[PDB]
């Protein structure tokens, strides 16, 4: 048995960077969306 | 060789295409390119 | 300036109104195709590429 | 129509394959190569067609 | 010579927007085609119909 | 062997051979550059998918999925059909060992390189007749210290055999089998660079500093004394990674950090015993061992380091 | 993000009255009409160039110098 086997830190990484980067929340679309920077009101 | 300047400490250092980029006094990954000395032309309107 | 057009100042904008800049950033990698084939940052010879 | 369209043709039996133009083999650096869906879909029929010939 | 009529004048704010003619104006002769429908690609950036 | 079905663009006109060619992608023309007269015409430039030539070579799959409105009976008979395939079997076992190369070196938090660069180090010395009664886990460690190698991002043995549990014997047997194929076919169809040396304990002190969690200054000097270290023939015999830790322990007191030797040992695994025993030998040239600028500025002085 | 030279309208100098406009407002605690009308500035639109002036170089001098000599 090894712990450093048994438990993936890249599910957990992989999940929220893949759910964050795109749209899509699971494993909804549109969730997030590239900040708007063209001015500051906007 | 080519000179960069660091982003943070800004440290004035010569780089070639086997040296690794990095600052080699405080080890910053960022380096911006030293501007050129060659003069150039601006039209004041 | 009929429908929606309008008439501005030529000596204004000479001046510097509503003059603004603008930047534009281009992002390039040197991609490693595996373990034999790779890119690097070079000024290309018309004999050699 | 006994000419053209019969009954008994709806059923197929040999596949045409349609030419590349239909399905082009596109690249996005030209270091890698991509192919159209339709080439996926024709090798998967080719391997099930193989396999079964194979079993039976 | 004066104007018949009188001028509503005063200051006001106003902003520029993102919108520029240099931008958007593009012409096409001929160009690159489609590699499946062989017709004008799209885009203004990429030659396109 | 086959068909030329090769063709050249040459002008007409010109007859000059090889002709100057200009492609005016914007007018999408190929044309002549001496007399300008056009060659050809019509210039072309999600329907496609990604493909991965080299690791995968020509395998084309598709898989089967659920759908907006789909019964699960259809889709559970589907995949078991798939699944049951004789000649994608073959396949499978090489997409299966990629498979747990990928978990290995993910869970290593490695670069994506080395992934690559481990399931093409397999795919190259698989299927081969010397490589057939080791060890399919000795094989995957080999591929991935090879691949660590390859992205100047070389790991240790130790390293490696954390995460694969495979022993001495069949790794280093496995590695210098491995090495010889890649050496075959590099010629006959590179592979190798100064990098490729067993002992590169430059690449290791970085990494061994971090761990410390020492200043990039000490890391810096580090890197100088190891450097300077191999010019000593009574230690230049010893393991890279006894050179590189003595000599992280050496610019630790140097420095007057606050970390016995019996943390450095602990933490990369080094009997205490060697680190003494070692240290005695560097500190008989600790004029050679340390840079000349630091010691002229006066951040460390030679008198700071215990002596025996 | 400086003083404008000149005034958009009638081209009239303006960049040159941006510290006495300051120096009004802080040591003599003169209001802002009074000020832009001690400097000069009887046309309003020279008084708004003035007026509604933002100096954001001072918010950028706050970063260090890209490349110090
Ligand atoms: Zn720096
Ligand atoms: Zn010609
Ligand atoms: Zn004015």
């Known amino acids: 048995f090894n712990m450093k086997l048994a438990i993936n830190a890249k599910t957990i990484t992989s999940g929220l960077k893949y759910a964050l980067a795109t749209g899509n929340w699971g494993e909804r679309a ?12 906007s | 060789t080519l000179k960069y300047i660091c982003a943070e400490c800004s440290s004035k250092l010569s780089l070639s295409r086997t040296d690794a980029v990095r600052c080699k006094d405080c080890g910053h990954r960022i380096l911006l390119k030293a501007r050129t000395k060659r003069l150039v032309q601006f039209e004041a309107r | 300036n009929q429908e929606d057009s309008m008439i501005m100042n030529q000596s204004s904008i000479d001046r510097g109104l509503f003059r603004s800049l603008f930047f534009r950033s281009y992002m390039d990698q040197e991609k490693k195709y595996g373990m034999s084939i790779t890119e690097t940052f070079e000024k290309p010879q018309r004999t050699n590429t | 129509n006994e ?3 019969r009954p008994e043709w709806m059923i197929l039996t040999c596949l045409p394959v349609p030419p590349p133009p239909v399905r082009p083999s596109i690249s996005f650096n030209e270091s890698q190569r991509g192919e159209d869906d339709l080439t996926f879909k024709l090798a998967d029929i080719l391997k099930a067609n193989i396999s079964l010939e194979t079993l039976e | 010579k004066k104007l018949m009529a009188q001028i509503f004048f005063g200051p006001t704010y106003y902003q520029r927007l993102r919108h520029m003619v240099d931008d958007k104006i593009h012409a096409r002769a001929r160009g690159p085609m489609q590699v499946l429908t062989r017709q004008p690609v799209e885009g203004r950036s990429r030659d396109g119909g | 062997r086959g068909p030329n079905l090769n063709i050249v663009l040459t002008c007409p006109e010109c007859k000059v051979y090889p002709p100057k060619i200009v492609e005016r992608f914007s007018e999408g023309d190929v044309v002549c550059a001496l007399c300008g007269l056009v060659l050809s015409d019509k210039l072309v430039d999600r329907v496609g998918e990604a493909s991965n030539p080299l690791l995968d070579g020509n395998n084309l799959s598709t898989r089967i999925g659920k759908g907006e409105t789909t019964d699960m009976r259809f889709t559970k008979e589907l995949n078991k ?25 993910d869970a290593a938090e490695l670069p994506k390189i080395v992934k690559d660069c481990a399931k093409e180090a397999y795919k190259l010395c698989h299927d081969e007749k010397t490589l057939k009664g080791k060890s399919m886990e000795s094989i995957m460690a080999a591929s991935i210290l090879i691949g660590c190698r390859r992205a100047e991002v070389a790991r240790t043995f130790k390293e490696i055999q954390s995460l694969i549990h495979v022993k001495t014997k069949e790794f280093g047997k496995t590695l210098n089998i491995m090495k010889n194929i890649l050496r075959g076919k590099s010629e006959d169809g ?5 990098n490729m040396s067993g002992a590169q304990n430059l690449t290791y002190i970085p990494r061994f500093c971090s761990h410390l969690g020492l200043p990039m200054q000490v890391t810096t000097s580090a890197e100088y004394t190891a450097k300077k270290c191999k010019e000593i023939k009574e230690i230049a015999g ?13 610019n630790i007191l140097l420095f007057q950090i606050p970390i016995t030797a019996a943390k450095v040992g602990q933490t990369l695994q080094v009997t205490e015993g060697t680190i003494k025993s070692g240290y005695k030998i560097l500190y008989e040239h600790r004029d050679k061992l340390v840079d000349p600028q630091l010691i002229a500025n006066g951040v460390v002085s030679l008198d700071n380091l215990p002596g025996v | 993000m400086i003083v404008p030279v000149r005034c958009f309208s009638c081209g009239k100098v303006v960049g040159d ?22 400097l000069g500035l009887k046309r309003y639109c020279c008084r708004r160039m003035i007026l509604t002036h933002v100096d954001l170089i001072e918010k950028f001098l706050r970063y260090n110098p890209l490349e110090k000599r």
């Open chain 7, 17 to 38: 009255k941006w510290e006495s406009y300051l120096n009004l407002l802080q040591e003599d605690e003169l209001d802002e009409g009074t000020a832009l009308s001690r």
């Open chain 6, 81 to 105: 059909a798939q699944g049951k395939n004789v000649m994608d079997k073959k396949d499978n076992e090489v997409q299966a060992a990629f498979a747990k190369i990928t978990m290995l070196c």
């Open chain 6, 190 to 194: 590179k592979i190798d660079t100064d």
């Open chain 6, 238 to 250: 010893k393991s890279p990674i006894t050179i590189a830790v003595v000599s992280i322990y050496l």
């Open chain 1, 30 to 41: 549109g969730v997030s969306q590239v900040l708007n920077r063209y001015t500051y009101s």
């Open chain 4, 3 to 5: 000419v053209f369209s």
